[PDB]
UniProtKB/Swiss-Prot annotation, chain B:
Protein name: Protein mono-ADP-ribosyltransferase PARP15
PARP catalytic domain sequence ranges: 2-198
Protein's cellular compartments: Nucleus
Domain of life: Eukaryota
Residues that span the membrane, as ranges: none
Effect of G80A: Slightly reduces catalytic activity. Abolishes activity
Role: Mono-ADP-ribosyltransferase that mediates mono-ADP-ribosylation of target proteins. Acts as a negative regulator of transcription.
Family indicated by similarity: Belongs to the ARTD/PARP family.
Length: 195, 198
């Protein structure tokens, strides 16, 4: 049950689709980036059409909507990666087992494109190209994280197995989210850009 | 997709169901266990009915069935754990970030044994304060596998020149597999808990 904005895949399950500059989809995603990254040059934006990653994400999304009994569990975040990790993330998504981990041993997602735009995350390749994903993240109900977490803390010490969905640096004004489970993040767009 | 032999859960998402000796379900697990663990005695066997884990598991199984060529992708395997781990596993399954380092390491992931005897070692199924040991019977998507290596944090590529086309799991020995390692969430469904004692 594959989204509208996706384009036909000739019965295949995976495709990177280069967006057309000037059209609505490219303009929406470019504007999310340029809010904090208007000094960088965008070379291209690719929609990630990964049927498997999508299915697994959508299943986790329906589970978290039931669990939390409301539907505001999704946020759009950024993730800066090096050139070598791009093929893996496109095909297999984010992997905590693969950078400071101050708020737990999960995958890190930035609210601001500027945070992910740092060279330590979006590592320039030899040609100077940087890579950042626009990611759908199931942040759900979150709390402050701390070093050493391997899962989010429980929502009550009385019930140790009922967990928060993610952790953040700051609950009132978050700038990053950590998630600790595969398939809590769908990599939706890859931005190729330069300094 | 909840299987029709599961007990009704009255719109609940999790339930442990104690099995009865003399039923085929209990007896087939007992026989699988006693095959290599005849010196131990089973206290009880519970069916694990976790709606969410089962759904995420079945999605990965259908994905691996499409990906691989008519492969038998799923094995029934054993997992020894400590009493402190049973509530997390029952509710959230098997988390590689919590895995113990195995005495013979074939990668940094969750280990599953062919033989109950392996899982029955006190190192895995640690005796609780009452002398009870705990072993899961687990549906595992082993898929297409190769000999593992201690450095692995994911299964290796089938081909070094295509680094993203991966083996599903690794084993200690591909001619005679005794353990499997899996590197991803929802690639194992904890189906039964065996409580046993000396
Ligand atoms: O401590 C970290 C580690 C990784 C990381 C961040 C903070 S923000 C970000 N965007 N992409 C990757 N990352």
């Amino acid at each position: 049950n594959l989204p509208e904005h996706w384009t036909d895949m000739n019965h295949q399950l995976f495709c990177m689709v280069q967006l057309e500059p000037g059209q609505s989809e490219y303009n929406t995603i470019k504007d999310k980036f340029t809010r904090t990254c208007s000094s960088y040059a965008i070379e291209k934006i690719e929609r990630i059409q990964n049927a498997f990653l999508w299915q697994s994400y959508q299943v986790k999304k329906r589970q978290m909507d039931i669990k939390n009994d409301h539907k505001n569990n999704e946020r759009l975040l950024f993730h800066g990666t090096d050139a070598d990790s791009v093929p893996y993330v496109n095909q297999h998504g984010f992997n905590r087992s693969c950078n400071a981990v101050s708020y737990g041993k999960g995958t890190y997602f930035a609210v601001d494109a500027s945070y992910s735009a740092k060279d330590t995350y979006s590592k320039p390749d030899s040609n100077g190209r940087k890579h950042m994903y626009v990611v759908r993240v199931l942040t759900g109900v979150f709390t402050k994280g701390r070093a050493g977490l391997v899962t989010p803390p429980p929502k009550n010490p009385h019930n140790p197995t009922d967990l928060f969905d993610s952790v953040t640096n700051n609950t009132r004004s978050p700038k990053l989210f950590v998630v600790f489970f595969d398939n809590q993040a769908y990599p939706e767009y890859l931005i190729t850009f330069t300094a």
